[PDB]
Amino acid sequence: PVNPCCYYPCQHQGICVRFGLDRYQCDCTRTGYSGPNCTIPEIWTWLRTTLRPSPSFIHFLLTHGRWLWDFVNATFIRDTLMRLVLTVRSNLIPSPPTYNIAHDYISWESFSNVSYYTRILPSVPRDCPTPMGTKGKKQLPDAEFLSRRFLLRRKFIPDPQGTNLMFAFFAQHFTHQFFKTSGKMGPGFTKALGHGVDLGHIYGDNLERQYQLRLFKDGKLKYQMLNGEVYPPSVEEAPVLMHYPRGIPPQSQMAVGQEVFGLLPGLMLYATIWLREHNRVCDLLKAEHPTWGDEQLFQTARLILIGETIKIVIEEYVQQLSGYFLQLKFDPELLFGAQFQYRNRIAMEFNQLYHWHPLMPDSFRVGPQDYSYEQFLFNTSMLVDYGVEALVDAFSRQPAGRIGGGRNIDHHILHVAVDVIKESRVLRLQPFNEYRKRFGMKPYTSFQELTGEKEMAAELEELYGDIDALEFYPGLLLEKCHPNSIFGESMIEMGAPFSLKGLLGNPICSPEYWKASTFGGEVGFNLVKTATLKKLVCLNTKTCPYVSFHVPD
Amino acid sequence: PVNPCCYYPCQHQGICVRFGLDRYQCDCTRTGYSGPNCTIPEIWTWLRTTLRPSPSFIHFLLTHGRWLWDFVNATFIRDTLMRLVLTVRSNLIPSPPTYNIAHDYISWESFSNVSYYTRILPSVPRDCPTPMGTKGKKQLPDAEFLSRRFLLRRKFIPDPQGTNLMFAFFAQHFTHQFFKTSGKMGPGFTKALGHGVDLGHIYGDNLERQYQLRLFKDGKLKYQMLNGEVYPPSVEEAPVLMHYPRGIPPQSQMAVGQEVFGLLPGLMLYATIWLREHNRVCDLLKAEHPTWGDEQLFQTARLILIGETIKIVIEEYVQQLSGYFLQLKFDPELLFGAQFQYRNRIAMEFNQLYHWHPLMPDSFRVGPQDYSYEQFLFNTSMLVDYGVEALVDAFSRQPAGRIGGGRNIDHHILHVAVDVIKESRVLRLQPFNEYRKRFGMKPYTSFQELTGEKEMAAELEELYGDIDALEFYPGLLLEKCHPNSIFGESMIEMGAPFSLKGLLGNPICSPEYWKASTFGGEVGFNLVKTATLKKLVCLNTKTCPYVSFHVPD
């Protein structure tokens, strides 16, 4: 007997449940629908859906008519839409979290064991005919061949939005505080138990690591002086597990919150920047609170930095990324009138989705120099040789690659993509179209409709056999881009909910935490409120380089 | 220079922050007040505070005019009031949690490290004149003397509400799933990382223990057959850490979710009850879903028992506790329209508050028999000798002591109270009056006013020296009861919010979880919705005893 749930019968987020030997029932509770498969809509649901403009139209709106938007932005409407934007997106994401790699059903273990990633759609049942459920072939396309054919970069395709490598290294650095898959526990498990913006890539995912990183004087982090400039300490002075290539001595390793940040100078750039910021904040705080001890200064500084990070990520990172003419605003108070849970759980689909490897260029231009991947990867002196100002200037001037559209991953790192697909198959992720429906979009009817061309569409059709068997991450990276945009609609409509749920779902964004007292007073509160990229860099440097998420022209 | 925060200057939940070398500022944000000490009310606050009757009045209302209430209970006014009460009560408890033993300010460590109990009020600063702040003597009254003088039971004072020992062991069993202070980490730390109704006192507070407890067949837990009856397995079959007296044979040690439950026959009684309920539920589940694996059966059964637990606690336990004519109701949907955080962090004050040892009698009568503490404590055969029915009936018939009033703790266990006071001094809890104010009550102006009598009042006045120096637990246990009640107004006004948050803050109460599919369909859902103590016991027994939370007429 075939598992009926393999047909994914229940629509509109209805929960398929197995009854008896060969029967199923759909839990249609609070879906807005009724019927055998949650297909019969209610009043307001029908009104809502029939009056819903397509995401493409909305995107068009947000990206055109600079007049209208320069007006809107200067009025309360900004907040209004923002709030709307806030309330509509977050709701897509189940909170408290639902399933994980072990349970395709709600369970107490799924809730209490934060060692798991969560998931939005349950896995493909193991007793299913084809790997992706019902459609497709007996064996999924070869991962390697797939990547080589459709994801491998031939000629470099720059991001049409002007995104630079400053953005890229910020994205990598930032996301690697909640994307930390456990190699010992395997796919579906994580070491970043903060499940959000806890800045564990600065202070460590665990207490002992944190303590080894701390000066325990004035709340500050350990550091070393080189050429008159502050840098992370060595593993010698801060005995912390760093993942370096063997043969490199603890004397030559720098210690930071994330074990892998030594493998790239952009990463260690951001570690350096945030370290300096932390200690500078500590200085402000101690100036304001002479009676405070090390602990309170450290903790408060950490809070301020979390606020600053959320503030900048929203008002500049996601800004640049979105290309919206609507000015995005970080203000927790907008949710103080809403039904919002301040908790976050990193999803596996979010992990898969954020593999923005096409961003990385062919080489790395630093001034008149051009360093290859071998020169750049695992380079242990570049940061110290050039300094922060220079690398920030350089990265901010060099453009990143377009994420969506296909054929734009440098061959040096294509293997990652391969592995992603493979992990997707171990994680038994549902097909792309299922996730499409899951985030409020119509499923595609053909590969042509996905790619917007015919060649790749034809060959993909050859490989998969059915569009309903197209895999999630391939689907994201091969989908046609919005006009002049950095990726397609799926990347946005799937990524945005996770993104803002993780940003605003942070406890500091709660009525309980969002106070001056929490940040040591008005000075800290303002540090959070007025945080920009430019300030974050220049306030901790001697000189001020070009600092921006986009190229200067 | 004296710490100004020692004077507790900040009013109405304002946050005192130490500025400069001898200054302070109050964070008055969203308190409803303004001014230096947050003493200047906003218009709506003022209005609200003028129209608000006292807690005693509300108590009178809830405890008089059975007619009016019998009308309200047959209407939607029940739901309206219940919702009112829910909102109002829950808004007192900070969510996300604020402070812990290490941190008297908001920190990321206090949010993320769930090994800590939380606290509503910060500790008395370590740089204060008197132990309680600025009032009282340099030394607190001797805990032992305090206990002997004001807590030692002379004559047994039965609870005027009709409470039995079935209730007492229920309260103990139930609350020991989230009260598990760490003997190794010390005061202010917990092993129950669940921080709520997770039923770890059945399944274990860690995964390893859980697995050792599980049959891994059909979702059930291991068990043993004695005299044709089902009991928890022996340690020999389920090798887990249980705290038994050295010398007791392993085949005489039953393995349950909570390590200390072998020390009392009441505890092991309830443990047995819940075990049988779990396996029975599994029978129902598997009958409904033959294709299900042991894991899914287990997890679903667990969630069902959690639901039944909150159901019974709210509609019968708390009902008997409060004595309200308002029939309380467990309905998560009452909160679907409001702003509520489905998370809980066990507060240390809640721990202290819930020390209801006066409930325990002088002896434990079982039918014609009457056992002593030396016969009842650590008795490892009593439960099997009498059986479930017999013990349930027995405990249901024998009365329990009144909690409030004073001088009603049996001398066998009085030491506990001593150790509590001591710990309250370790925890540096604020004085009774500060917590009174924190929970929307007016501070007591004398011990006279507190006790309602003159003897205890005068001696207490001599010992403490000032009313504003009266400690938390002493104030709770010595405060005059409501007319014919089991305790006074403080035990209710501080106990209610915590309890409330603990029950409804459970993620199963969430709109995300509160679906039939979560409980394996209509059947499981109905089990939760119609759960009953009477049913809990009699459905798993052979014969049906007297089972209730109050003595018969």
Ligand code: HEM
């Ligand atoms: C030279 C630049 C980069 C290199 C060498 C690199 C390499 C890698 C490698 C080797 C992994 C682990 C793969 C595995 O263990 O199978 C990884 C993971 C990942 N990378 Fe990249 N990457 C680069 C840039 C980026 C950028 C710019 C992003 C932007 C978001 C990114 C996103 C991710 C994500 C989301 C993961 C998953 C991490 C986890 O699951 O814990 N990478 N990368």
Ligand code: HEM
């Ligand atoms: C024969 C009956 C009882 C005995 C022998 C007993 C004994 C004890 C003992 C020895 C402790 C630990 C004290 C320490 O470690 O210093 C304790 C703690 C405690 N007791 Fe009882 N008790 C009894 C009844 C009850 C009841 C009916 C309740 C109902 C609420 C209760 C509530 C508590 C609580 C909440 C704790 C704190 C546990 C923790 O923080 O981990 N006790 N009791």
Ligand SMILES: *[C@@H]1O[C@H](CO)[C@@H](O[C@@H]2O[C@H](CO)[C@@H](O)[C@H](O)[C@H]2NC(C)=O)[C@H](O)[C@H]1NC(C)=O
């Ligand atoms: C969270 O779940 C994981 C997965 O079950 C737990 O790790 C497992 O522990 C069991 C029993 O202790 C072992 O048999 C498995 O080998 C473990 N699995 C893996 C992949 O390591 C983990 O202990 C749980 N975490 C908590 C805090 O309970």
Ligand SMILES: *[C@@H]1O[C@H](CO)[C@@H](O[C@@H]2O[C@H](CO)[C@@H](O)[C@H](O)[C@H]2NC(C)=O)[C@H](O)[C@H]1NC(C)=O
């Ligand atoms: C790491 O990067 C540094 C740059 O800081 C590289 O050093 C430069 O590389 C070439 C020499 O072959 C020239 O551009 C410069 O003369 C070097 N600059 C300095 C300051 O020495 C270095 O080659 C890289 N290291 C590795 C192992 O690739």
Ligand SMILES: *[C@@H]1O[C@H](CO)[C@@H](O[C@@H]2O[C@H](CO)[C@@H](O)[C@H](O)[C@H]2NC(C)=O)[C@H](O)[C@H]1NC(C)=O
């Ligand atoms: C939660 O906090 C406690 C207290 O800080 C941690 O326990 C301490 O850990 C440090 C370093 O690991 C030790 O030096 C202390 O002796 C420990 N104190 C106690 C009382 O155990 C605990 O590890 C933290 N837990 C988590 C998960 O972070």
Ligand SMILES: *[C@@H]1O[C@H](CO)[C@@H](O[C@@H]2O[C@H](CO)[C@@H](O)[C@H](O)[C@H]2NC(C)=O)[C@H](O)[C@H]1NC(C)=O
């Ligand atoms: C544990 O409780 C049992 C009851 O199950 C006690 O055994 C009974 O003791 C009384 C004495 O007061 C006798 O009259 C009964 O005949 C006994 N019943 C049985 C079945 O033996 C026992 O004394 C208690 N054990 C301890 C160590 O105190």
Ligand SMILES: Cc1cnc(NC(=O)C2=C(O)c3ccccc3S(=O)(=O)N2C)s1
């Ligand atoms: C590929 C993407 C990853 N994350 C994206 N996020 C957004 O599109 C998005 C936000 O993340 C967000 C953050 C804070 C407030 C509001 C928004 S958003 O409207 O959901 N939007 C731009 S898009």
Ligand SMILES: Cc1cnc(NC(=O)C2=C(O)c3ccccc3S(=O)(=O)N2C)s1
């Ligand atoms: C001494 C007390 C300990 N716990 C108490 N709880 C109540 O007074 C109380 C509840 O616990 C509660 C539970 C569920 C819904 C509503 C209520 S309540 O209104 O806060 N109330 C009776 S009183």
Ligand SMILES: *[C@@H]1O[C@H](CO)[C@@H](O)[C@H](O)[C@H]1NC(C)=O
């Ligand atoms: C519901 O789904 C099942 C399986 O896909 C199908 O047999 C049935 O016809 C569907 N009914 C409706 C109304 O969509």
Ligand SMILES: *[C@@H]1O[C@H](CO)[C@@H](O)[C@H](O)[C@H]1NC(C)=O
């Ligand atoms: C505020 O409280 C402090 C401490 O009790 C007191 O000294 C001060 O006079 C108060 N100020 C006002 C304006 O009430």
